[PDB]
Write a protein that binds this ligand. Structure first.
Ligand SMILES: Nc1ncnc2c1ncn2[C@@H]1O[C@H](COP(=O)(O)O)[C@@H](O)[C@H]1O
Ligand SMILES: Nc1ncnc2c1ncn2[C@@H]1O[C@H](COP(=O)(O)O)[C@@H](O)[C@H]1O
Ligand SMILES: Nc1ncnc2c1ncn2[C@@H]1O[C@H](COP(=O)(O)O)[C@@H](O)[C@H]1O
Ligand SMILES: Nc1ncnc2c1ncn2[C@@H]1O[C@H](COP(=O)(O)O)[C@@H](O)[C@H]1O
Ligand SMILES: Nc1ncnc2c1ncn2[C@@H]1O[C@H](COP(=O)(O)O)[C@@H](O)[C@H]1O
Ligand SMILES: Nc1ncnc2c1ncn2[C@@H]1O[C@H](COP(=O)(O)O)[C@@H](O)[C@H]1O
Ligand SMILES: [Ca+2]
Ligand SMILES: [Ca+2]
Ligand SMILES: [Ca+2]
Ligand SMILES: [Ca+2]
Ligand SMILES: [Ca+2]
Ligand SMILES: [Ca+2]
Ligand SMILES: [Ca+2]
Ligand SMILES: [Ca+2]
Lengths: 122, 122, 122, 122, 122, 122
């Protein structure tokens, strides 16, 4: 129940919010979409329970994925831009704790960092 | 660059800083580490360049992954808490633009949201 | 969006409104329903995205279908009355333009025309 | 006997009427066409009697289809825009009743609705 | 078409509200969920159409089910508490009428009565 | 220990009372009945103790079921209208607590809600 729309604010808390509309919801999965003119935006939220095995811990996996599809322009073919996250924890873990990691990741990942990453810096 | 240490600030900004040390770097990858008594933290950075197809756009992937390994204690076996991000764009893409989508995601993913996610809200 | 209810106004504008309720949504599809004693109404919305071919334009299909199911009575077996529309355009196409063609069709299809059609007039 | 021409009024009862010429008529089927410069328009009207089976109701099916073909422009390949309708009823059904549905569909499908559909809303 | 949330008011009217979040909706089936520290609540709604048979009436089933799950606590293993209702009627029946029977049941089943049932008073 | 009669108030509180007569009581099971000119009402109460298994919790089921049976009328064959509830909990659970969940269900299930269910609103 995340809502009927999902807003992607390009460039961070700065601005250029793209409000996507819920387009589908199946198997603990939602999809939002916003067609635009020269590109379209899409967001997916999925939840999964990793395959239980005999003598081992069972994990849950949560995923959020943003995708921008840039339509072909003349000779330039169509391509995509995409970013997503995956949170993974044992079933029964302390959510608050889990939330703190990832909360830490979002914090770590900022404009300056993405810049470096794209530059292949490690 | 990217640094010799990497700080995972649990709970996000103002949270508990865990400063890891770069301990290894192979195959366009980095591994930072910070051992403790009860658990250990590990962060990995990975860069990939999907293969050139005859008639296709060639993409690059950038991945950052935080992992807290909680050592087994008593009856409770060892388990993990993990969160990671993946950025994917075509080769010649405009960095700023791409970065903006990642910034949008980091911005979207806050404590409140993570809560809902763990609660299986789609 | 699109609504939680869907109103089928028999006889067109000013006709008999039949307001159905959304009862299901799976695979980029919606199903609205309104049961009655003698018959039941059902409306389905479907979205499709034809597969990417090596050297071809990729199309999307949008379909809306009204269906009145008249339950069997006496010797008269159960039968149906059904009308539906399909809109098809390439992926990056200009929405306004596309919409205009659908508007042209809705406009073309009025009572008088439907009459002729049923009369096999070509 | 729908006439020698068929007018497609783009954007609805607003304007931009494209008057297509009858181009062929075979097997209870007519085809109109209008070549234009950067695109061409085509309309098809078909009538069918669904395959009779032993112990079941037999249906008739009527179809009207508008198609705009946009010729290739430089690097941009040729593509199409298309919208069509299908009315389906048992043989012997009360035409007026049948006409009311569809009459209801045309009414339902307007600029605002098409907008949403193209946006993949359900 | 039920709603992003579903509230379970323990102890009936004026009791303790537990607002669950819609987690999924698929085969004409909904699922709400609300995880908590010591237990979790889950509600499901299911609609069925019983097996259509030759010379017989066609029935529909409507089910609603509440389930609190108390997580294991020390020696005490995990267990649940369930309460669910089923409404069954033939296709075409008069909703108002059918509804009256369900209302009769809800009305009948109050605290005093549940007490007796749990007490095995037949 | 239920009572010589059981009243089914159609339409819930303030509705039409149908006081049924206890007809039998045997395997921790009761049965009330009230025959009428055009239909008959019948209520049943059943208590069960689920299959006791090795390393598992032992559950008990409590069921109550209302059934109006409308006798065949001319062409219209005979059919029923059912509504029943099931309460399930482990042996030893706290009655008050369990009861609260049933009360929550009864409270939740009102006329408006039944309307939606019959309407297949999931
Ligand atoms: N809120 C929840 N918490 C934990 N497990 C859940 C929850 N909702 C559903 N599940 C489990 O996830 C399964 C579906 O996983 P699948 O879809 O990846 C269900 O059949 C349940 O076992
Ligand atoms: N800065 C770069 N940008 C794009 N591709 C690169 C770059 N540096 C190296 N590569 C290619 O990417 C390959 C590694 O692919 P994967 O493994 O990450 C290398 O062996 C190079 O051919
Ligand atoms: N908004 C969208 N525009 C275009 N394609 C989409 C969109 N959302 C999802 N898709 C793709 O269309 C597929 C469904 O195709 P079909 O089945 O309708 C999905 O699994 C996606 O890969
Ligand atoms: N006006 C009409 N009403 C009903 N059936 C017709 C009519 N005109 C032709 N047919 C039937 O349609 C058949 C041709 O169908 P086909 O062409 O799809 C004919 O051989 C007749 O059986
Ligand atoms: N609104 C409806 N009323 C009655 N039958 C329906 C309705 N919607 C779907 N069905 C039928 O019930 C099937 C699904 O049954 P399920 O739910 O047990 C569908 O595939 C249809 O055949
Ligand atoms: N009051 C009770 N509480 C719990 N179990 C009972 C009770 N009375 C009988 N039983 C058990 O349940 C059986 C009957 O189950 P039935 O009712 O499904 C009895 O023969 C006992 O083993
Ligand atoms: Ca930026
Ligand atoms: Ca669904
Ligand atoms: Ca926190
Ligand atoms: Ca009319
Ligand atoms: Ca227009
Ligand atoms: Ca001919
Ligand atoms: Ca109580
Ligand atoms: Ca009532």
């Amino acid at each position: 129940a995340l809502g009927d729309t999902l807003t992607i604010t390009l460039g961070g808390s700065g601005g250029t919010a793209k409000v996507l509309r819920k387009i589908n919801q199946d198997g603990y999965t939602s999809e939002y979409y916003l067609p635009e003119t020269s590109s379209s935006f899409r967001a997916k939220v999925r939840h999964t329970k990793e395959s239980v095995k005999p003598n081992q811990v069972q994990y849950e996996r949560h995923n959020v994925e943003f995708t921008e599809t840039v339509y072909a322009s003349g000779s330039t073919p169509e391509f995509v831009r995409q970013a997503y996250v995956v949170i993974r924890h044992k079933v029964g873990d302390v959510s608050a704790t889990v939330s703190d990691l990832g909360e830490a990741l979002s914090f770590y990942l900022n404009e300056a960092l993405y810049g470096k990453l794209i530059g292949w810096e490690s």
